[PDB]
Amino acid sequence: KKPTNILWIYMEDQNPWNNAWGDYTVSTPNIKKFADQGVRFTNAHQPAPVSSATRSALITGQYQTTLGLQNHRSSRASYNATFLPEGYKTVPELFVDAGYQTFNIGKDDYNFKYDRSKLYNAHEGKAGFQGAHDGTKFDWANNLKNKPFFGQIQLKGGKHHNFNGKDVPQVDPDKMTLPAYYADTPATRAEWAKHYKTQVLSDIELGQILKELDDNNILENTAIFWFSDHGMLLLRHKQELYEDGVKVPLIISWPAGKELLKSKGAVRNDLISGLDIPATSLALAGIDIPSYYDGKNVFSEEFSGRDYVISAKDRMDYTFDRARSVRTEKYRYIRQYHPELSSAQPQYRDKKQYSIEARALYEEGKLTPVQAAYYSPTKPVEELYDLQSDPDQIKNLAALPKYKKELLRHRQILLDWIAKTDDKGAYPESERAVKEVLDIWGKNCVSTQCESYRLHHPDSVNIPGDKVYSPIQWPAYMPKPKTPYYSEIEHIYRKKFQ
Amino acid sequence: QKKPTNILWIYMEDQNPWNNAWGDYTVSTPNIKKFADQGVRFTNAHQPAPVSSATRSALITGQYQTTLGLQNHRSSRASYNATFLPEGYKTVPELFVDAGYQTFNIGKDDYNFKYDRSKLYNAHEGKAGFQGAHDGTKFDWANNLKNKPFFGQIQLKGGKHHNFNGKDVPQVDPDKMTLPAYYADTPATRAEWAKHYKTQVLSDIELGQILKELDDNNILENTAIFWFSDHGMLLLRHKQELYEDGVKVPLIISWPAGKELLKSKGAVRNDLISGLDIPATSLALAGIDIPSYYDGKNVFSEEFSGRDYVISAKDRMDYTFDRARSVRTEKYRYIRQYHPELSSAQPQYRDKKQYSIEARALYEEGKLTPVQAAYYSPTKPVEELYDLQSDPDQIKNLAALPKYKKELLRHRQILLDWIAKTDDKGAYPESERAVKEVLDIWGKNCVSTQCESYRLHHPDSVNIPGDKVYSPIQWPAYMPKPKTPYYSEIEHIYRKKFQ
Ligand SMILES: O=S(=O)(O)OC[C@H]1O[C@H](O[C@H]2[C@@H](O)[C@@H](CO)O[C@@H](O[C@@H]3[C@H](O)[C@@H](OS(=O)(=O)O)[C@@H](O[C@H]4[C@@H](O)[C@@H](CO)O[C@@H](O)[C@@H]4OS(=O)(=O)O)O[C@@H]3COS(=O)(=O)O)[C@@H]2OS(=O)(=O)O)[C@H](OS(=O)(=O)O)[C@@H](O)[C@H]1O
Ligand SMILES: O=S(=O)(O)OC[C@H]1O[C@H](O[C@H]2[C@@H](O)[C@@H](CO)O[C@@H](O[C@@H]3[C@H](O)[C@@H](OS(=O)(=O)O)[C@@H](O[C@H]4[C@@H](O)[C@@H](CO)O[C@@H](O)[C@@H]4OS(=O)(=O)O)O[C@@H]3COS(=O)(=O)O)[C@@H]2OS(=O)(=O)O)[C@H](OS(=O)(=O)O)[C@@H](O)[C@H]1O
Ligand SMILES: [Ca+2]
Ligand SMILES: [Ca+2]
Ligand SMILES: [Cl-]
Ligand SMILES: [Cl-]
């Protein structure tokens, strides 16, 4: 027995602050039911804490660092291009070859160039944000009720702002309990309260999709994967490698096979990677998992939980940095490759009130040492956290002789992973890639990489990159589509940021 | 459970097995014959490259040279252009060092990455080699290590020997040489054929010397010897090219105290193996785990039954930019040509050799047969496919014949599977710093599109030494650069006379 369809319900920027995880701050009845009749994973760790790196990893089936897709965002300009290897199959292409209809409604946001019609054959693409393709809305549930499909539905998750419905409860910022590493500021409490409100909106949106499936008699035969790309928007969640930056909600539901999926436990606490989502989607559909994919079928008789899970952070917008984390059963380890750069480096959230207010308290000397660690001008080279005693990860154990054995063990796990994958974050980005950062962000970039670029190009620094550099021609095995929006997504230059 | 005490590679340059153990009795090769008779002889060992630095880099890292960006001959030699192996990576010698062995390589390394040689070879010191390579210094290894388990390599000149004045070397008449049909019959071509036979005798003498040194130090029985060459001989469709005798090399493995164990699957092994299986088999015999990322297998494991196919790759060679991949199955050799617009006779380092001039002269005069003239045509086919039982000289391309379309597609997809799983770095253009390194060494000899474009983009610095154009690359924190003087010497690759 196998499901007829695979569906990813794919949310942005959301942690599982809902009833199925035991949080009754707000009411999330659809999610609670959905989890009760499916399999809920309490230890699903995405390989990145930011959109394009996680989404590129999951769609290619490998850590984003292995194929050079790690930098958020990259390969968007006309003059800077990453193409997947000749013969390579992304997860949608594997479903296409097996005869499925494929679609992704909403953003792709992949850090390579591609003919979208080869991935998603059931609808048209259009231009998205910052060089991304988006898939157009269409009546997927009716058009494909008699056609096996692999689909994705992109939802806003933590990026929702529409709280005007009568169903959205009051959440008092004054009654929020903030973790000890965040400054207690009005805008920080407000974002905490707002993230709870987005749980109700995700609950509503989950209900909409299940109803559409039921109305078209494809509820029973569809395996749904329900997860987010990374944690919520505050400064030590999204963009960072702590527990709730990368650990995401995940529920898997296949009503006609629910007893099979539940065999290993309806609540799954073993370590899995987000990379196991595409591998399990293929296995459930009956499609061989390519040898080069990193993920596993989490429902196979052989799968007993990962010994460790890796996450990676690299460049984010104009913030150049590199760090890697190893999560074992009991510890989280972070290796910092730029200890000379502050975690409070300039970044895209710098004009948000929650960031302004926190930084202000730091400069006035009013933060606790736990709150101020983020703002110190340097980082430790290694962090190690005992997650049972220190779930907020505020007690670095890496300098304690009692923990040197665990530190060395985690340090070598990372080395094993770098050696076998040749982590491409070890190598500096090309000058053409730096120019793409400058096209989009201009004077916001203050990195050593950007200052070096400007010194080297005094006559063209503010000229749009597609007037400085020749376009990259696409490979013979993947000709460039003539579809107009492929030109649109490459117009990344923003005059206002120069 | 028995294991040899030592591993020894007898590592020859540019040599095909034209010796008695392969049935060739043109000259007498008694040491090689006896060595093969008492060991295991491999008749289908295919190196992953037809040129020195690409093969040697592959075998020392345990992976296809194309996977780690080591495929371009030569690369990573200058001060300003550097490839470093990944953090945490273990080369084959490093694995032996960690297991407590003494390690050495006497003669050239010629690897396409930067490295602290002392971490690979802990029993002797390096010195400056040719074109940016490290060389290992000569020392009395057999006496120094007769009581210390070791992994050693002894580099021999093979086909590059050219001192034939010893009384031990027979006369070989160029007029009685039989050349293959794709070579022009010219005096200098016949002369190189005869010379290659003479180098078989020189390799035979040297093998006997090494076995005697081992026996003189009571390490003959407890040493597993791997006897092989890095690729085929120097003529134009052997070395540098992906035909059968470019990449298929001699290989004998001999471990006298384990002789019955090694022979269990056969004293003559015709199954397909890769040169990458040499380091993997060396590790397994010594009892060292083969890393998960290595490509090779233990050819003596009960599970090993021969590869279904073997891949070889050619990329840049000196200033000749090109890219081609071959798939060798039981019956066929397939070649995919990624630059069909470039002639196989495009400019290359052998252009001033008389055997090359004489053959090209015959081409220009219209005196070559169509089989001889194919090499000199202005374009290459996009794909080549040869039935090796019917066409061992690979002179009848089957790729355009409908009877062979199923095999063509089968081989084409084997290559695609391998590109997808390894991310073949030859798909990507070399950096401007890497191109400048070619220009330092070869100057105006480079006429490739890459070099012409580099000059067009650097019109004021074309002949300035690269180390004056580009800042030196700093070595990673996990592998600091040694202060040893010769490390600066090997980076001086600029040649004024070629500018
Ligand atoms: O230009 S950047 O945002 O700096 O690009 C870098 C950034 O891109 C991705 O995230 C942003 C994008 O998804 C864009 C798409 O338009 O929207 C951004 O959200 C904007 C604000 O950051 C956000 O403020 S916040 O209160 O959530 O923190 C939000 O603000 C709107 C709301 O306040 C509503 C009601 O309250 O009123 C609006 O006026 C506010 O918009 S604003 O006045 O223009 O600031 O919505 C903003 C735009 O949304 S819109 O409806 O399309 O107009 C995203 O930034 S976000 O803070 O992260 O959500 C990348 O996110 S990803 O990795 O998840 O893909 C992000 O990492 C970074 O690359
Ligand atoms: O500068 S290059 O050779 O163009 O570098 C590119 C080349 O390097 C590798 O192979 C060469 C090197 O190993 C160097 C080391 O010095 O020597 C080269 O051999 C020289 C001649 O090419 C060779 O021509 S041959 O057809 O006769 O074999 C040979 O010529 C000598 C003989 O003819 C004898 C007998 O008359 O007299 C000598 O005077 C000749 O030497 S000459 O002064 O050049 O006329 O020997 C030469 C140097 O030999 S010596 O020991 O220094 O005295 C190698 O080129 S070879 O033809 O392929 O052997 C690369 O080879 S590798 O992949 O195996 O490492 C090669 O691919 C290429 O990169
Ligand atoms: Ca997101
Ligand atoms: Ca050689
Ligand atoms: Cl976005
Ligand atoms: Cl360290």
mmCIF file of N, CA and C and ligand atoms in Angstrom, chain B residues 13-14 51-52 56 108 160 230-231 239, ligand 4:
data_model
loop_
_atom_site.group_PDB
_atom_site.id
_atom_site.type_symbol
_atom_site.label_atom_id
_atom_site.label_comp_id
_atom_site.label_asym_id
_atom_site.label_seq_id
_atom_site.Cartn_x
_atom_site.Cartn_y
_atom_site.Cartn_z
ATOM 1 N N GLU B 13 56.334 5.633 -14.274
ATOM 2 C CA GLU B 13 55.782 6.610 -15.206
ATOM 3 C C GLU B 13 55.544 5.970 -16.565
ATOM 4 N N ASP B 14 54.459 6.388 -17.224
ATOM 5 C CA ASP B 14 54.286 6.302 -18.684
ATOM 6 C C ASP B 14 54.650 4.918 -19.235
ATOM 7 N N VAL B 51 47.115 11.044 -17.372
ATOM 8 C CA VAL B 51 48.231 11.967 -17.177
ATOM 9 C C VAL B 51 48.623 11.969 -15.703
ATOM 10 N N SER B 52 49.873 12.365 -15.435
ATOM 11 C CA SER B 52 50.509 12.110 -14.143
ATOM 12 C C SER B 52 49.741 12.713 -12.968
ATOM 13 N N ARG B 56 47.859 10.662 -9.940
ATOM 14 C CA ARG B 56 48.514 10.591 -8.637
ATOM 15 C C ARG B 56 47.714 11.316 -7.562
ATOM 16 N N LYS B 108 58.840 11.817 -7.125
ATOM 17 C CA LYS B 108 57.853 12.881 -7.265
ATOM 18 C C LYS B 108 56.542 12.533 -6.571
ATOM 19 N N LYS B 160 59.861 6.961 -19.308
ATOM 20 C CA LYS B 160 60.694 8.157 -19.430
ATOM 21 C C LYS B 160 62.188 7.877 -19.332
ATOM 22 N N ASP B 230 51.425 5.015 -13.746
ATOM 23 C CA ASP B 230 50.386 6.025 -13.571
ATOM 24 C C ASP B 230 49.485 6.178 -14.785
ATOM 25 N N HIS B 231 49.964 5.794 -15.977
ATOM 26 C CA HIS B 231 49.206 5.830 -17.223
ATOM 27 C C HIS B 231 50.084 5.288 -18.347
ATOM 28 N N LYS B 239 49.336 8.396 -23.808
ATOM 29 C CA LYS B 239 49.372 9.485 -22.831
ATOM 30 C C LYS B 239 48.525 10.666 -23.294
HETATM 31 CA CA CA C 4 53.569 9.904 -15.916
#
